[PDB]
Design a protein around this ligand. Structure first.
Ligand SMILES: [Zn+2]
Ligand SMILES: [Zn+2]
Ligand SMILES: [Zn+2]
Ligand SMILES: [Zn+2]
Ligand SMILES: [Zn+2]
Lengths: 321, 112, 292, 355, 196, 21
């Protein structure tokens, strides 16, 4: 894809996009690629992550979500829309896009279309709302109602597919095809009206069902099994780590570019013991005034060097213009 | 594993086992040996199909009578789960006993 | 401003000081150092009445806490001095007398490795105990004699380098005073530089009090305002693993992090027995590319 | 029994610390910190709120991470409005990451999270990482749902192919995808998904992640990395730095091209050669030769000394208040045992014992 | 009202329909959403197709919300005739049988949450008439029903659920279940010898 | 003034497009 070294080095449009915005990078490019003569290809060789990071920012999209449910009209009612939301409506509801592309540039402007769409029955049908015959709807959008019904049939086929026998409820009712018992009470069947026709509540239930199926199928875009699921994992052998161990043997050569005997050590150890037991004078520690000056001079010699270095150990003030 | 009941060697398809499964198997074997009906209620969180198949298959494969087994479920999906569990049990038995013993097991449903 | 704990780590051993005396013309110089240390500790107790003192001696066969004395009286020093100073000086000399007599008993015992790393580690533990027990600063002083030719300091690398990080976590500057022929100790010098400490090297034992009172007398409470008298400059470099020469640019194993000046023989690490891929090592072996 | 209850609890805690084997750990790391900034993070379960506490601990984690792993790299990502926003590129400078985190502290979290977008961004940031570095992602998840534009399973497979490792710190409860992401990515291990139970546990979880992750035996990436040890210079006049092109009084000198740098450890901006000091490598020696745990000495046997070997503390006179090291056989006090295995990394008795 | 709109922000909504094949697709979508972290909520009937063989374990099952006791339609001639027949012949009270029929369906759905002992889930029975039906539930479900949970509110139940889900997400100590809830070959033999 | 910096870049990139094309 467009996230590799080869393609990013060749994507000149992207290379211009980030350089246009970035200032410090732009300054360097101007001095080194325009007047100095450095090839453009080599300049971007060492800045691959910068190019990739800039592309990923605009190359990612939000996930599918019910857009019309979040839309609350809030006599006049003001409903706030956004460009991102408008694109989302087109993606989640292809019928809305169909009515949009064929009318916006030909008959009426975009703002009129959205005002009509919200006041139409399609916006109530697309939403999981029971259509009321009392509602007037909108003339333009109401025509597409039949088209949406046809699209729903197409969507049902686009989603229909064989299901694993583990969760295949169709076969359970067909296990015995000759079951002739008592018909279930009206509580276990879809609601009906006086005339015996449907009330329309199952339609909205399927509508939300269809929306969820479409959203999940969108995730799995271009971008045996039952054996593992039916097994009890808790009864299996606990996971065992396969980490590696290292025994570090430490032995290295010594760094490269008068020994006394035990008798001498004992004599010196006796001498220090004899000096300590006899008497210890702390006053003799004072120097003789001939080495004290030398000692101070040596120490001050290092202080001056350290003080000079430590005095100058946001850019520092410069004397140049 | 492969543990022993009073006279019945039973091969569990897992290295571990719950206390309930052993009690469930012991009670089932008592029911079969003594003859008659019984009602057992084991929690759904404990391996249930494995216990029944493991013991019942062993009972058929050990005693001379070689009694057959009838496993009645309520839906076609449950038959698949039982058969999948049975396949795992038989595969484990073949791996442990060293040979595929003469065993035939089939489900049943409608033509549809 | 606040009390500060002083922990002195003195490295006394028959093999070290005897060589120092033989190399020079000073006999019994250890007495001079001991007296200078006694005065130095008394000076620390005079800077404030709330600061304690700790002395840990590293002898040939281990370490011993000279002060404070373990819970488990010849007159070396005159009793006319201050009570608090005497209470510390007298105990220090008595423990010194006991330790050297013990060392003399085991003179024939074989001791090949120095015990400076252990003493420094013990001192850091004491600093933590004081800090947690009872708002007290800390300071470590390593008074080692480098005149004696050391056998091998490599084994002192891993321990000492570990004390640097610990010392930097408790804000405990470690000062080092070296008395010996060698001008620089690449391990001790790094310890002082990386811990806001002071390293000083002196060849003559006489007049040591002047060095101690003028250089290593800086308390932790006023470190930021006094420039250290350190003169040597360290490089923070380490020697190779199979050549023993300082390396400015080289190779290190990604598993054990052992420095290697050159590619190890056999295309295998000599520290962890890890086999390097032939292709990857061949990448390093490549030479610069120049047009024909 | 109250005092005995504490001791047995300490013994139980020590039980996990008794099995210390010298596992091979990857000292050179490449971490990506994915933080969650969504509507789910506006709750008040963590005072003042999840967003504030997580950022505060993240800053502390950044400080600790670079202190114990000086030759590692880190990046930070945030999940906002269903998209992954990059706030810090992979770099060894601890100050840049802290600066980015502080800026994030102001903006309010909103929108839905997206693990796939964050993981896909992480896959890219870690692509230009050498083969000797361990690519790791530390996700701090706070939501119970994930809205993604594509198949998360495909991304999980991609992460395994690139030898990336993922650690997830949830907030409310377990999530199935996160468990699979951590399990299928850590070679089957299920210990890399941690759910905090209070604020104190949260601090431990971040602190635990600071330590290097042990490597698997079948994952071999052994090699030699060309490193350099520069020498610090003290110049009287300011000079232009080769990294930021600014006037700095001091700086290190590279041994390969003589170009100067401001701070370490960083890769030379000229020869692309890593520059480090001997101290930076010494900081990780305790991860290769861990100190063997100390075993409580039973009171039945006799003791050596009445005071501690290292701190000279009188052992309090049932249970023996002494800990001994098998290598040197020296008793230690309870206080020393904690400081010798956490701050220090060398047994004073072993060093003091001659050989 | 606008309640489903709030639900959509957290989980996808899958509904059971009279058509069996469509419901199977809903289950397929419901399972996929649970695995990928998007989250889904399945609305189904207690006496329908999804409650008679479909199991929701591990991610699939984390909370079961029983909306009322699945009582039968009392005003049905077939049911009344059966109740009269049972009372006259088997001496079964009409109310007792209705409660027995209702609780056995409620328990059926509750038991489809757990497959192994490492699985967990929260069972909530939202009805006032459930308070006195604790003794009619299966034994293994009543033993976990604390006396304080016989009559709770939405806020109290939510608080308990948050604490429970947090607790069950922690690593379990192997020693606590080494030989008290899970048995190895050595443990099984020990139990046999001790009993013998 | 930044406008010339972008214009010269735009002219150079326009020249780049003209040169490459
Ligand atoms: Zn190595
Ligand atoms: Zn710079
Ligand atoms: Zn360089
Ligand atoms: Zn101690
Ligand atoms: Zn030891």
């Amino acid at each position: 894809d467009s996230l590799s070294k080869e393609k990013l080095l060749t994507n000149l449009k992207l290379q211009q996009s980030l350089l246009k915005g970035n200032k410090v990078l732009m300054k360097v490019f101007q001095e080194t690629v325009i007047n100095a003569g450095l090839p453009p290809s080599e300049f971007w060789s060492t800045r691959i992550p910068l190019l990739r990071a800039f592309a990923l920012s605009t190359s990612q999209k939000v996930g599918p979500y019910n857009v019309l449910s979040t839309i609350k009209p809030v006599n006049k009612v003001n409903v706030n829309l956004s460009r991102e939301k408008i694109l989302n409506i087109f993606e989640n509801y292809p019928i809305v896009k169909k009515a949009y592309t064929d009318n916006v540039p030909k008959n009426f402007k975009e703002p009129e279309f959205w005002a009509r769409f919200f006041s139409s029955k399609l916006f109530r049908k697309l939403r999981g709302e029971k259509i009321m015959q009392n509602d007037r709807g909108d003339v333009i959008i109401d025509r597409y109602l039949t088209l949406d019904q046809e699209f729903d049939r197409k969507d049902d086929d686009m989603l229909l597919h064989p299901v694993k026998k583990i969760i295949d409820l169709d076969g359970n009712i067909q296990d015995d095809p000759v079951v002739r018992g008592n018909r279930p009470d009206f509580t276990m069947q879809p609601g009906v009206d006086i005339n015996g026709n449907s009330d329309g509540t199952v339609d909205i239930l399927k509508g939300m069902n269809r929306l969820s199926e479409k959203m999940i199928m969108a995730l799995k875009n271009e971008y045996n099994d039952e054996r593992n699921e039916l097994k009890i994992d808790d009864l299996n052998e606990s996971y065992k780590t396969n980490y590696a161990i290292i025994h570090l043997k430490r032995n290295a050569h010594e760094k490269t570019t008068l020994k006394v005997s035990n008798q001498q050590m004992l004599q010196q150890l006796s001498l220090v013991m004899d000096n300590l037991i006899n008497k210890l004078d702390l006053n003799q520690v004072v120097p003789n005034n001939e080495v004290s000056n030398k000692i101070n001079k040596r120490v001050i010699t290092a202080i001056k060097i350290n003080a000079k270095q430590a005095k100058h150990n946001l850019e520092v003030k410069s004397t140049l213009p | 594993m492969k543990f022993y009941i009073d006279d019945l060697p039973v091969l569990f398809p897992y290295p571990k086992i719950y206390p309930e499964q052993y009690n469930y198997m012991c009670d089932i074997k008592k029911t079969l040996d003594v003859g008659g009906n019984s009602i057992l209620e084991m929690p759904s969180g404990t391996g249930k199909t494995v216990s029944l198949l493991s013991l019942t298959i062993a009972y058929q494969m050990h005693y001379p009578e070689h009694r057959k087994i009838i496993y009645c479920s309520r839906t076609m999906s449950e038959i698949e789960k039982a058969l999948v569990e049975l396949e795992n049990l038989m595969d484990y038995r073949t791996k442990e006993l060293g040979y595929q013993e003469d065993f035939r097991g089939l489900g049943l449903t409608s033509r549809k | 401003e606040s009390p500060s704990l002083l922990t002195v780590i003195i490295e006394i051993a028959p093999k070290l000081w005897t060589t120092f005396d033989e190399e020079g013309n000073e006999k019994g110089s250890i007495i001079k150092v001991l007296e200078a240390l006694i005065v130095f500790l008394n000076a620390h107790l005079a800077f404030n009445s709330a600061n304690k003192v700790a002395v840990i001696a590293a002898y040939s066969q281990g370490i011993k806490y000279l002060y404070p004395e373990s819970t488990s009286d010849l007159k070396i020093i005159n009793s006319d001095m201050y009570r608090r100073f005497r209470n510390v000086d007298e105990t220090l000399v008595e423990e010194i007398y006991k330790l050297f007599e013990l060392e003399k008993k085991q003179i024939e015992q074989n001791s090949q490795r120095s015990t400076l790393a252990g003493a420094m580690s013990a001192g850091l533990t004491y600093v933590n105990r004081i800090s947690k027990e009872s708002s007290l600063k800390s300071r470590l002083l390593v008074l080692t004699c480098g005149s004696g030719s050391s056998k091998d300091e490599i084994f002192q690398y891993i321990p000492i380098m570990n004390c640097i990080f610990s010392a930097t976590k408790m804000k405990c500057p470690i000062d080092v005073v070296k008395i010996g022929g060698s001008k620089e100790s690449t391990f001790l010098q790094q310890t002082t530089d990386a811990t806001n400490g002071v390293y000083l090297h002196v060849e003559s034992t006489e007049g040591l009090i002047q060095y101690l009172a003028t250089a290593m007398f800086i308390d932790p409470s006023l470190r930021p305002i006094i420039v250290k008298p350190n003169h040597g400059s360290v490089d923070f470099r380490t020697s190779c693993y199979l050549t023993g020469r300082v390396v400015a640019v080289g190779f290190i194993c990604s598993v054990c992090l052992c420095v290697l000046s050159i590619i190890p023989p056999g295309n295998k690490c000599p520290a962890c027995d890890s086999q390097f891929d032939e292709h990857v090592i061949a990448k390093l072996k490549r030479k610069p590319v120049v047009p024909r | 029994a109250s005092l005995v209850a504490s001791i047995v609890e300490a013994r139980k805690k020590r039980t996990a610390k008794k099995n210390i084997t010298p596992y091979q750990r990857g000292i050179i790391r490449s971490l990506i910190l994915t933080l969650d900034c969504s509507e789910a993070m506006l709750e008040k379960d963590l005072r003042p709120n999840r967003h504030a506490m997580i950022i505060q601990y993240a800053i502390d984690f950044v400080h600790e991470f670079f202190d114990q792993n000086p030759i590692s790299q880190m990046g930070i990502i945030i999940m906002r409005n269903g998209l992954a926003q990059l706030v810090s590129q992979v770099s060894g400078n601890p100050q840049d990451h802290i600066d980015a985190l502080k800026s994030i502290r102001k903006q309010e979290p909103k929108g839905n999270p997206s693990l796939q977008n964050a993981l896909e961004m992480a896959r890219g940031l870690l692509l230009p990482v050498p083969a000797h570095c361990t690519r790791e992602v530390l996700i701090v998840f706070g939501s119970l749902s994930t809205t993604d534009p594509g198949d998360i399973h495909q991304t999980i497979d991609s992460l395994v192919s690139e030898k990336i490792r993922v650690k997830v710190l949830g907030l409310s409860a377990q999530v199935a995808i996160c468990k699979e992401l951590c399990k299928a990515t850590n070679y089957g291990d299920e210990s890399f998904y941690k759910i905090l139970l209070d604020e104190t546990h949260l601090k431990e979880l971040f602190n635990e992640a600071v330590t290097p992750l042990p490597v698997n035996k079948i994952n071999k990436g052994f090699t030699l990395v060309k490193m350099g040890f520069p020498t610090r210079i003290f110049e009287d006049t300011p000079t232009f730095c080769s990294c930021h092109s600014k006037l700095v009084y001091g700086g290190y000198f590279c041994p390969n091209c003589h170009s100067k740098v401001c701070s370490l450890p960083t890769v030379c901006p000229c020869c692309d050669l890593m520059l480090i000091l001997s101290t930076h490598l010494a900081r990780s020696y305790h991860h290769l030769m861990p100190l063997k745990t100390f075993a409580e000495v039973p009171t039945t046997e006799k003791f050596r000394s009445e005071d501690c070997f290292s701190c000279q503390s009188r052992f309090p006179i049932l249970t023996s208040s002494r800990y001994r090291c098998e290598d040197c056989k020296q008793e230690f006090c309870v206080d020393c045992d904690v400081f010798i295995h956490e701050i220090l990394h060398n047994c004073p008795g072993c060093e003091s014992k001659p050989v | 009202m606008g309640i489903l709109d709030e639900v959509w922000k957290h989980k996808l909504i899958l509904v059971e329909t009279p058509d069996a094949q469509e419901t199977s697709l809903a289950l397929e979508t419901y399972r996929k959403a649970c695995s990928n972290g998007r989250g889904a909520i399945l609305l189904s009937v207690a006496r329908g197709k999804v409650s008679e063989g479909i199991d929701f374990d591990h991610q699939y099952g984390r909370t079961v919300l029983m909306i009322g006791i699945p009582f039968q339609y009392t005003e049905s001639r077939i049911l009344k005739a059966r109740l009269e027949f049972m009372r006259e012949n088997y001496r079964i009270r009409e109310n007792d049988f209705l409660s027995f029929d209702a609780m056995r369906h409620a328990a059926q759905c509750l038991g489809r949450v757990l497959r192994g002992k490492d699985d967990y889930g929260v069972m909530v029975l939202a009805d006032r008439r459930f308070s006195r039906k604790r003794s009619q539930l299966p034994k293994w479900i009543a033993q976990g029903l604390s006396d304080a949970d016989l009559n709770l509110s939405t806020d109290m139940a939510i608080s308990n659920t948050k604490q429970f889900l947090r607790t069950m997400a922690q690593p379990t100590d192997p020693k606590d279940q080494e030989g008290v809830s899970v048995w190895s070959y050595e443990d099984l033999i020990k139990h046999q010898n001790s009993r013998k | 003034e930044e406008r010339e910096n972008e214009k010269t870049l735009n002219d150079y990139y326009a020249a780049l497009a003209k040169k490459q094309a």
